[PDB]
Design a protein around this nucleic acid. Sequence first.
RNA 1: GUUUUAUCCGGUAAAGCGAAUGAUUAGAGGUCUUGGGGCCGAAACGAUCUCAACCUAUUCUCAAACUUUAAAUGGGUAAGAAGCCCGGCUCGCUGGCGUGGAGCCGGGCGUGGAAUGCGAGUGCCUAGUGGGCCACUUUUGGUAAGCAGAACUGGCGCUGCGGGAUGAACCGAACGCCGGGUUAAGGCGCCCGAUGCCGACGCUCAUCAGACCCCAGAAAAGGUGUUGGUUGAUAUAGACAGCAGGACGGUGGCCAUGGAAGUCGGAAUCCGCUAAGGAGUGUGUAACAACUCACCUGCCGAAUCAACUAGCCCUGAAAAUGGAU
RNA 2: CCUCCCGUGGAGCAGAAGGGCAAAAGCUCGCUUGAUCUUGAUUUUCAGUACGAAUACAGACCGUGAAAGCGGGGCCUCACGA
RNA 3: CAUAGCGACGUCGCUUUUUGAUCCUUCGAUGUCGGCUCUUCCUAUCAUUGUGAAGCAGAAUUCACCAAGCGUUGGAUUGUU
RNA 4: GUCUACGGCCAUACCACCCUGAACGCGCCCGAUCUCGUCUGAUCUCGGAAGCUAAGCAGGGUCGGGCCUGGUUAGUACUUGGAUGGGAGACCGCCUGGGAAUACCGGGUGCUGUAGGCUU
Lengths: 213, 159, 168, 175
Amino acid sequence: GRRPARCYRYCKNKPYPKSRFCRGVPDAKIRIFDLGRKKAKVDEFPLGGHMVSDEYEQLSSEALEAARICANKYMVKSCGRDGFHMRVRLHPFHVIRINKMLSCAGADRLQTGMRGAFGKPQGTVARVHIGQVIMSIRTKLQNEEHVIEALRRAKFKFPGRQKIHISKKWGFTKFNADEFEDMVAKKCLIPDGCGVKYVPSHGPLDKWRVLHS
Amino acid sequence: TNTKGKRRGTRYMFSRPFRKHGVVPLATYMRIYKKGDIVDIKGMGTVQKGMPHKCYHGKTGRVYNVTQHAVGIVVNKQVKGKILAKRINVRIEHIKHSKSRDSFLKRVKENDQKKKEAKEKGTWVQLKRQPAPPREAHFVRTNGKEPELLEPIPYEFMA
Amino acid sequence: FYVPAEPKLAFVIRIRGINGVSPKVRKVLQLLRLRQIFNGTFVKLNKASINMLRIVEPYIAWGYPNLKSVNELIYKRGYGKINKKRIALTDNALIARSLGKYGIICMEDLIHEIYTVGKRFKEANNFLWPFKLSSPRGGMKKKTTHFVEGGDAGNREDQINRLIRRMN
Amino acid sequence: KASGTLREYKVVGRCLPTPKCHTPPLYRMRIFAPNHVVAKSRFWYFVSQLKKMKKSSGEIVYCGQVFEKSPLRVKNFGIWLRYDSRSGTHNMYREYRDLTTAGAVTQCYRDMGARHRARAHSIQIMKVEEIAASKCRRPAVKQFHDSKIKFPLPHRVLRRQHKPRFTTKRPNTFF
RNA sequence: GUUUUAUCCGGUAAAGCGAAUGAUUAGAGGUCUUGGGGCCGAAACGAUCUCAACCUAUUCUCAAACUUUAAAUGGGUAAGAAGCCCGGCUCGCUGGCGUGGAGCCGGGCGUGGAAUGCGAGUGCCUAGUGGGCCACUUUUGGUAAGCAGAACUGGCGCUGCGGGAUGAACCGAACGCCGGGUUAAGGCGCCCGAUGCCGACGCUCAUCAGACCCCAGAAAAGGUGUUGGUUGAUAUAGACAGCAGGACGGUGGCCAUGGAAGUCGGAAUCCGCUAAGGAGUGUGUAACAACUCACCUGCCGAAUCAACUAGCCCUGAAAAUGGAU
RNA sequence: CCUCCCGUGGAGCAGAAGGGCAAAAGCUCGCUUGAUCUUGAUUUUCAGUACGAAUACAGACCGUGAAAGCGGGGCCUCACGA
RNA sequence: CAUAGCGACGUCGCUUUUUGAUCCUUCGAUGUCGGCUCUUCCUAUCAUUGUGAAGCAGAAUUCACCAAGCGUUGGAUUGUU
RNA sequence: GUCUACGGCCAUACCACCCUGAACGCGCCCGAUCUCGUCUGAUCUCGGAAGCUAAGCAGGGUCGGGCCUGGUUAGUACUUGGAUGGGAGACCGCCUGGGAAUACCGGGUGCUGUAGGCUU
Ligand SMILES: [Mg+2]
Ligand SMILES: [Mg+2]
Ligand SMILES: [Mg+2]
Ligand SMILES: [Mg+2]
Ligand SMILES: [Mg+2]
Ligand SMILES: [Mg+2]
Ligand SMILES: [Mg+2]
Ligand SMILES: [Mg+2]
Ligand SMILES: [Mg+2]
Ligand SMILES: [Mg+2]
Ligand SMILES: [Mg+2]
Ligand SMILES: [Mg+2]
Ligand SMILES: [Mg+2]
Ligand SMILES: [Mg+2]
Ligand SMILES: [Mg+2]
Ligand SMILES: [Mg+2]
Ligand SMILES: [Mg+2]
Ligand SMILES: [Mg+2]
Ligand SMILES: [Mg+2]
Ligand SMILES: [Mg+2]
Ligand SMILES: [Mg+2]
Ligand SMILES: [Mg+2]
Ligand SMILES: [Mg+2]
Ligand SMILES: [Mg+2]
Ligand SMILES: [Mg+2]
Ligand SMILES: [Mg+2]
Ligand SMILES: [Mg+2]
Ligand SMILES: [Mg+2]
């Protein structure tokens, strides 16, 4: 029912989002993008490991769903259901089309060949660049090998080449792990849920004195 | 297969800049345009009357006729392998004085003054502007400071 | 550190042929009077001429000639454009009758005005027919790439003299 | 960048003075290049990467060859470099033995081309340093640190295979 | 069919979405409501617990028909004698004004007001053509096409010659008839001109090796083949590998049961003995049992181990007449 | 329905979309017929032919406004015929 | 008991024995289906030879390797493939 | 040092809140006979001058939002021209020139024309 992904591997078209011009798009295969203990605080999961593409290509929503399921199963097996938090960082926004031909023994049957060849929406894929992050897993610092193995197993659900990278940031934040603790101590960062709020040294002094109090 | 409407493809060309909509400032009306002076045709979209065609946006021409609200401009247009001097009527909202002509006439007046002054004081002076000459010989002092040694940095994957 | 003056004279040699040339490159080569492969011309260096050389960089090899290179080029292959004709410079009267009004009356004056880029450099240089040099004896490295990447095109600083010795 | 027998060049440059800093800083690099033209080009490449400089906005105040201060002494060279493979960029530390620093860098370029198919435009030499024989880490270099080194030349191949081209006697490989 | 110096023009590439318009992920903090409701609140949900919606500050990801910002390349104009500067005259237009504007008439100023190159201007008559195709790059439709359709330049058509064995288009170079010299792209075992150099350094063994733009065949995934490199770890307080032992007590630990006793599952990982021992890495017993592992020790006395990474080689790798670096 | 406050337009301008517009070009009133009579020039498609449409003028006769002014159809890009 | 034998979600290929897509050759013509006859070739091996594996006790079967030497039939219906 | 009238550029000028305002002025303010408009003398129009700076307005303030301008991001992204460069490709590196934009970190918070007043 679905064409091989090699037919839609490369970014050959302009982006074709689901909009008021592209109507009738079927839903993407991936609906859930965050798994594990999403409610875990920032300091709970210091280690962050990403899986990073090396090819400018298109990843299908079915491939993202399969990789998410595989990584979730391995992480639940190894670190337990509350010991990790995974975030898929690719959303299938690019609609791929199909010019369907009649798969019978006849070309006279109104096939028309390449006339009016613009196709109906086949599905959705995500566009990934060289260096872009596909999946992220944050967890305790001692589950580094489990994160690496989960991402390695998830790599097999994707066409191109991917690298595993243990990032230097603290968890899913954009701040370095070595500089995270002192920044929180001096209140440049305030935890809220899975992320932190950066508090710059500007604004009203009332927001400063609600801190330090 | 393209339409031939007068304003096809002018969606951004005739749109106003960001946060510069509304009333047209009155200095644009207060400008003075004589015959023979050089104007740039722009074509703002706030004023829909007397608009230039999109092929004259960004062009520069010479004023030959002045009316109550517009001017007549002789502007070169290239059509296939020939350039022809078109004459267009454009309201003054869509034009402004070209500063290249102003700078050139200021240079001419300054050069004439230089000729007069140099003929008064005898000594010759250079008027033709020369292109950027090669740099001349000079000494670069170290000031007792050894130049900093630079080496390429090792690769690391960032994000 | 003493930084010398940037060289004000260049020798430009056209190293690629006349087949399949983009219009801008073709126009700039015609303006440099390099309408044939292995044609050489003295170019006075400024911003305009340097940018013109940058346009036609893949098609030329150029550099900074020295006094010996100027002497060899003018004496062995020097031809004047007298009455639109390519006349060999076998006498000083041929130079005097065309350039005497500028104070240039001999081969030495022509060489001086070319080497030290003088007031009448444009007249003295346009008097000279573009030099028709032979193939480089000993071969080139690679005419299709730049000099800095192992080839022959573009600006070699003062190795143009090594090129000239083999070229004429 | 092609090659040959590379030479070391000390290249010193600086930005052109502007009415923002009348005396911009001077920067010095060691460039291993076939000649001074390529050396200046590589200097501009590297300082464009490191600082925010261009050949047009700056100038080169010095470019002089650096002669080896002891070409009659065998010494160990460690070279820190980085290069682009077919599938990424890697940092390498390699060791060689040579009389000259430039000869060691040439050995490095040939060895990278031989072992990793790395062309010279992919390789960025970032540090060259003479190292003590106790600081060496590569066993192929360390095995020559013998005060009583001794080896024969076992199987000496005839190289004059065409003078004579035809002969009655078969060659000897033992000497 | 050019640059330079001035001066405008633009909304593409990129970027942005804690900026508008659309799309979209997740938590966090607040408190109103036809949200569910909530366990003891009817009684004034006496209460305040949860989930909604909403708001606020954040957060993940996007746009050919979105955008604050915004290139490179690009398009226009100017770089004087038809100019500049003095007087004067005409006007039925304009008008407080001898105003303004335009025109006209005299006169004076050449350092000829960037670079470079080139000799230009102009008229008449006019054939053939009006099926095109190809390549780099940009690009639309299509799974794709030696497919269909555009932009830019060059080419083939109209074109031979040197190289790619061969070839409309690739690379070099364009051509009167010749002699000598030298090259390009490409080559120099032999075919076949030229390495018959005492060429340099490495890599590689293929029982389908490999061998040069277009180009004429391959992928994911693997290898304890070999070669380099990165990070980490152990080791004379004796590593590693081999050979030989211990591998418990409570506890045949709890909830699982028809036996699961460490190992058909769910939770947590207690302590002492110390040389160590997981209330367990596996085999298994109907079940016990019996083995094994990670952990320590003994003998052994100098280095070793692991995970990656990427070069060549190998596996992956199957078609029809006998055959093609 | 009535009242206050906020409200850069997130409404409306006949219609498709895009542009434009706030004491506007929107809404409501008042007066009106410039949607009138004419000649040329010009722009758009372009061969620089036509039609259509449009822009700036000039000459009449009017409308409105205290007036400056604005108006010869519709805010602009289509709505047509030798 | 993942991997004796299988393989969801994904994903990489090969083939030209299917059918398409295209319209480069042929419209001053390349006789257009099937069968009969006859030869040769391929291997992605049904059997036979020699092996490896099994949830291979034997028997039978299944998976895989070297492998195309040799063989792969008689009939009812249908123009049939 | 300021204000008024008319402005030019149109946020460095806007927005929110707080403080101060001498003198002229600008305002608020008082009234409806006339002029003129309303459902309403609220607005508009007209005639004034008891009181007031409460508001408008002006100046200043806010680790203020915005806006303006710098640094960083970053010689990064992107890009003109080149190669018989790499790679099965996807794409990538180099040569030759040009070169950004967020986040983040600083500084600033109207300038000015004409005419006429006030300020010992
Ligand atoms: Mg298939
Ligand atoms: Mg497409
Ligand atoms: Mg060519
Ligand atoms: Mg020779
Ligand atoms: Mg556009
Ligand atoms: Mg974009
Ligand atoms: Mg948005
Ligand atoms: Mg046609
Ligand atoms: Mg085509
Ligand atoms: Mg033909
Ligand atoms: Mg031709
Ligand atoms: Mg030809
Ligand atoms: Mg040939
Ligand atoms: Mg071939
Ligand atoms: Mg080429
Ligand atoms: Mg010859
Ligand atoms: Mg050959
Ligand atoms: Mg031979
Ligand atoms: Mg192979
Ligand atoms: Mg009229
Ligand atoms: Mg109108
Ligand atoms: Mg066709
Ligand atoms: Mg026949
Ligand atoms: Mg026949
Ligand atoms: Mg087989
Ligand atoms: Mg046989
Ligand atoms: Mg602020
Ligand atoms: Mg570049």
